[PDB]
Design a protein around this ligand. Structure first.
Ligand code: MG
Ligand code: MG
Ligand code: MG
Ligand code: MG
Ligand code: MG
Ligand code: MG
Ligand code: MG
Ligand code: MG
Ligand code: MG
Ligand code: MG
Ligand code: MG
Ligand code: MG
Ligand code: MG
Ligand code: MG
Ligand code: MG
Ligand code: MG
Ligand code: MG
Ligand code: MG
Ligand code: MG
Ligand code: MG
Ligand code: MG
Ligand code: MG
Ligand code: MG
Ligand code: MG
Ligand code: MG
Ligand code: MG
Ligand code: MG
Ligand code: MG
Ligand code: MG
Ligand code: MG
Ligand code: MG
Ligand code: MG
Ligand code: MG
Ligand code: MG
Ligand code: MG
Ligand code: MG
Lengths: 260, 132, 143, 178, 56
RNA sequence: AGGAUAGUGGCCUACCAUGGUUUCAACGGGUAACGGGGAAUAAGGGUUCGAUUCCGGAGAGGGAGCCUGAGAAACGGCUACCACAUCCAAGGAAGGCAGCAGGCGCGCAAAUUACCCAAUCCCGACACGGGGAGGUAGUGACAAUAAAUAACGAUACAGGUUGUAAUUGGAAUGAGUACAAUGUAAAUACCUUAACGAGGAACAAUUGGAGGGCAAGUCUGGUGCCAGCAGCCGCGGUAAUUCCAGCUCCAAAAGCGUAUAUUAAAGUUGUUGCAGUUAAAAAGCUCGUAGUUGAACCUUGGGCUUGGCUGG
């Protein structure tokens, strides 16, 4: 109606932010950025609701205006900056590096990483095509454009971004046996290997994935993110739980043993 | 009478140059402990300046004898004056309550100025000429 | 075969037949025709205010023998004239001509109640004061 | 605006208002447990009616069904925890056999009287309402507070109550102070 | 019909004041009162139980 | 084929064909019709509702046309007409609360012309400004939660070792009031807590009923087919269990009654699941298109090996 919306009602916010109903009428509307609104995590939610470094929205803006917060190696001062999957958040004042990887419960885990691993990131190749003057380029899942890619790189592959020069270190071809995390749907956060890719021309390709516990699930190819060259060899540290989904009875049994 | 203070969920927050924690106050035979007295006690416990300590949001449990709140300890008084909300500094006497007209008067003055283009001095000078 | 279709593809016949036959249900018919909206003196409302035109005594039906003391009221919202019973021993003296009275039904939902012929409403308040409060001397009529 | 806050009714009235068999049973049950009104009996029957409904739905499922095993064990565990269900009756068939007197046994008012802290069940309620009884180290003044099994041993007078080592009350201080 | 007799009986009913009596207990105390009155000191007339026996 | 559009398209134009929808309900009419997530009631199947906290749409008195701009056919933007309506020195000028609060009117029907950006978020050139968005308090028996209005002894009696019925005590406590602290942007309130705060503990529980349905009087006085009650059946004509009252009792209780709608009861809308000889209801009788529904029949049995889960 007459133009873009600028507000986000609290009840209409993405459920994986885990916002409470009664704290207010509105929720942080993520800015335009590398990641989609529904699949992002604004830095205000991360710094206040997750880390609890800031006590309110006024304080998170004070934190970011002092140049502390870096996303993917660059300083961001937008409190609603849409950080997303595989993004690296650096707070060098606290000497902490985080990577936004989904946990098996469907939410963005608070996953601390080492400084050496915080020097790169993975991006799923969305498309490969030729730019002006006939220069090929790759578009990753976070909107990055890398020119002069390896001519073997195709869509659905994963590239390793140097994240300081923005170049591609190396890549993983999409094929059977590759390690995968699911980035959408009800199997979000699960980790397994590709068993069989089922093609449907004109529709949505489906990928069969086998868990480390030999559980098999099917998901759309658009929700498949290659994260490793084979089983047990991920290119990034996985969050606690290793993307293995436990039944509710198993979780109840595990919690009983953990607490005695 | 033997006020006991416990701190839990302590987080070191160099982003805002402070340490932040939940405060548990055990005050048997005592209605509660005033914020001013808690700041004095907390300053002695952690050997910090009293003006670098901020406490707020206290509530006494049902039946009394215990209160819970939130506390902040800054690395310096200068850091506290930089990151603390204005209303808390007025509570602690570190700042003066800014004096402004009521919200109705500020809005009414703003709408009166919307009817003037240019400086106020010109507008009143022109009005004087018109009425003279 | 019970006189109704049973085939797996006969849902249209079953649905239309029920729709045709619910018109024999007067509760359903009155709801969709909007008879309360068109014909009811209250226009579908639970209550309605009006002005007292005259105090009239109505003879009860047999085998009862009494003078049911009602009033003639012209409704403000639509100008219609109705007869409203004034309940309790001596509450007619609380109701005067050209007073504003709040009316309500007898609870029989548009039908006359008891031996009172042709009366379907009762007086609830007069001059903004509850008739029950006046009867029990809790309040006084503002005049 | 802000999201609505949920609320729900915690009781339901009988369909037939006047029934001597039900009226006598309720009054007999209220007199034994010192209840204020019939709504406190309706509340127990209402919450027991939905415990049975949950158990009935699980009992229609096949045995070894994941939902029946998970929610059935959880429902049994909660009832065992508050002492309503015995430790030797964890079968989800004994849940249906529960009765309203089982729940009224576990009220704070009933437990105060049965622990000897009060002369009668009616003395128990006023002791609770007047902030004399504490469960653990927390004063509870709600008579309907359902006592858990682990809370049973920690019911005693509040430490600052006249009956539990506190100072003399308002009346005594005015009398001995004159 | 004539309206002259409205309020005839109520007007001529001889006024009788309510006798002053102790308040009855309220709330839980009243349920206690009813419970004993009906299940503790039973006043049954050998299988004849009446809430409001008229004097006879 | 063109024009126009950001672009597809009878979107429009020129020329040319005569097509397109429909008893599987088109077209027209009504809607006390914004749609949905949902709500009420519900054994199951259902019935009713959804203006209204979220999503989508539409509108800014009624139409229409536009400027600017990435984005508006925007109305706290403009232009015109219609209807209302304001100031005027009579020449002219200025309007749009279905934003917040408030007023009139309408009605059965609905609150303060309050405080604040502290929170939630949004906007801006922005760490700083603004926000009747929003939050806070006021009014608020819409609904919902918990929950006081008394408890315990001694005598005296009755009574079957203890439940009361009375007149005698000392305890307990919060309703309320308040230093104070907390709370908060500042307050209010809550939560804590000095001092005060209960014998008729007047710190006094009400609303409906007492023939049946339906729990609880054949008590006393009044009236006398009157007055009145009574959802229904009925009561009232001189000992009225029903009216008006007193006493007593019953039901629910900080709530209880009445009116209207709706749901269950209703297997009285029946798919589950009604009825059609006589209670309402088999067309006077055949034909017949759509619709509904339509006989049987086509790899069965046998053998061998093996995986898992139930009982042991
Ligand atoms: Mg849209
Ligand atoms: Mg922004
Ligand atoms: Mg495609
Ligand atoms: Mg200016
Ligand atoms: Mg007919
Ligand atoms: Mg009759
Ligand atoms: Mg064309
Ligand atoms: Mg064409
Ligand atoms: Mg043409
Ligand atoms: Mg509708
Ligand atoms: Mg409409
Ligand atoms: Mg709607
Ligand atoms: Mg409407
Ligand atoms: Mg809306
Ligand atoms: Mg208007
Ligand atoms: Mg207009
Ligand atoms: Mg317009
Ligand atoms: Mg406006
Ligand atoms: Mg607007
Ligand atoms: Mg205005
Ligand atoms: Mg209430
Ligand atoms: Mg009182
Ligand atoms: Mg009464
Ligand atoms: Mg009566
Ligand atoms: Mg009587
Ligand atoms: Mg009876
Ligand atoms: Mg009645
Ligand atoms: Mg008869
Ligand atoms: Mg007589
Ligand atoms: Mg008599
Ligand atoms: Mg019905
Ligand atoms: Mg029938
Ligand atoms: Mg006949
Ligand atoms: Mg017949
Ligand atoms: Mg025939
Ligand atoms: Mg066949």
């Amino acid at each position: 109606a007459r133009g873009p919306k600028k507000h986000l009602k609290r009840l209409a916010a993405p459920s994986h932010w885990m916002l409470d109903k009664l704290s207010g009428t509105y929720a942080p509307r993520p800015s335009a950025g590398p990641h989609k609104l529904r699949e992002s995590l604004p830095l205000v939610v991360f710094l206040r609701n997750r880390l609890k470094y800031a006590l309110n929205g006024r304080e998170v803006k004070a934190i970011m205006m002092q140049q502390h917060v870096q996303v993917d190696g660059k300083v961001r001062t937008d409190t609603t900056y849409p950080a997303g999957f595989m993004d690296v958040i650096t707070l060098e004042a606290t000497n902490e590096h985080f990577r936004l990887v989904y946990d098996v419960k469907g939410k963005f885990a608070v996953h601390r990483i080492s400084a050496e691993e915080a020097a790169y990131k993975l991006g799923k190749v969305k498309k490969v095509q030729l730019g002006k003057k006939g220069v090929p380029y790759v578009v990753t899942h976070d909107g990055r454009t890398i020119r002069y890619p390896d001519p073997l790189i195709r869509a659905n592959d994963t590239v390793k971004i140097d994240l300081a020069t923005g170049k591609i270190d190396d890549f993983i071809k999409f094929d059977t046996g590759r390690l995968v995390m699911v980035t959408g749907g009800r199997n979000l956060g699960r980790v397994g290997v590709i068993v069989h890719r089922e093609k449907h021309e004109g529709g949505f390709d489906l990928v069969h994935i086998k868990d480390a516990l030999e559980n098999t699930f099917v998901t759309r190819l658009s929700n498949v993110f290659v994260i490793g060259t084979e089983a047990g060899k991920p290119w990034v540290s996985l969050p606690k739980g290793k993307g293995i989904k436990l039944s509710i009875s198993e979780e109840r049994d595990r919690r009983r043993a953990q607490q005695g | 009478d033997a006020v006991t203070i416990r701190t839990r969920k302590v987080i070191s927050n160099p982003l805002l140059a402070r340490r932040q924690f939940v405060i548990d106050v055990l005050h048997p035979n005592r209605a509660n402990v005033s914020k001013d007295e808690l700041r004095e006690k907390l300053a002695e416990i952690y050997k910090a300046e009293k003006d670098a300590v901020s406490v707020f949001g206290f509530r006494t449990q049902f039946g009394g004898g215990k209160s819970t709140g939130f506390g902040l300890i800054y690395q310096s008084v200068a850091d506290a004056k930089r990151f603390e909300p204005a209303y808390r500094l007025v509570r602690y006497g570190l700042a003066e309550k800014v004096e402004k007209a009521s919200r109705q008067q500020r809005k009414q003055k703003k709408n009166r100025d919307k009817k003037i283009f240019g400086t106020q001095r010109r507008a009143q000078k022109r009005a004087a000429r018109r009425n003279a | 075969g019970k006189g109704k279709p049973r085939g797996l593809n006969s849902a249209r016949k079953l649905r239309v037949h029920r729709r045709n036959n619910r018109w024999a249900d007067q509760a359903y018919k009155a709801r969709l025709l909007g008879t309360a909206f068109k014909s009811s003196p209250f226009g579908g409302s639970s209550h309605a205010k009006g002005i007292v035109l005259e105090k009239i005594g109505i003879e009860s039906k047999q085998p009862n023998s009494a003078i049911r003391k009602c009033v003639r009221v012209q409704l403000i919202k639509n100008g219609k004239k109705v007869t409203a019973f004034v309940p309790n021993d001596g509450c007619l003296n609380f109701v005067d001509e050209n007073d504003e009275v709040l009316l309500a039904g007898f609870g029989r939902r548009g039908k006359a109640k008891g031996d009172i012929p042709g009366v379907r409403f009762k007086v609830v308040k007069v001059s903004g004061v509850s008739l029950l409060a006046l009867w029990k001397e809790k309040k006084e009529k503002p005049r | 605006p802000r999201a609505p806050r949920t609320y729900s009714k915690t009781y339901s009235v009988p369909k037939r208002p006047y029934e001597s068999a039900r009226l006598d049973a309720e009054l007999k049950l209220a007199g034994e447990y010192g209840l204020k009104n019939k709504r406190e009996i309706y509340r127990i029957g209402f919450q027991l009616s939905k415990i049975r409904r949950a158990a009935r739905d699980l009992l229609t499922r096949d045995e070894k069904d994941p939902k029946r095993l998970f929610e059935g064990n959880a429902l049994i565990r909660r009832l065992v925890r508050i002492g309503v269900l015995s430790e030797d009756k964890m079968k989800l068939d004994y849940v249906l056999a529960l009765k309203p007197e089982d729940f009224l046994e576990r009220r704070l008012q009933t437990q105060v009287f049965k622990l000897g802290l009060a002369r009668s069940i009616h003395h128990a309620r006023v002791l609770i309402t007047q902030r004399h009884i504490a469960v653990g180290k927390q004063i509870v003044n709600i008579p309907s507070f359902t006592v858990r099994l682990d809370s049973q041993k920690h019911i005693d007078f509040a430490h600052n109550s006249p009956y539990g080592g506190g100072r003399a009350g308002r009346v005594k201080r005015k009398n001995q102070g004159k | 019909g004539s309206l002259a007799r409205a309020g005839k009986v109520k007007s001529q009913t001889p006024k009788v004041e309510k006798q002053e009596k102790p308040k009855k207990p309220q709330g839980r105390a009243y349920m206690r009162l009813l419970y004993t009155r009906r299940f503790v000191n039973v006043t049954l007339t050998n299988g004849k139980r009446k809430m409001n026996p008229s004097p006879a």
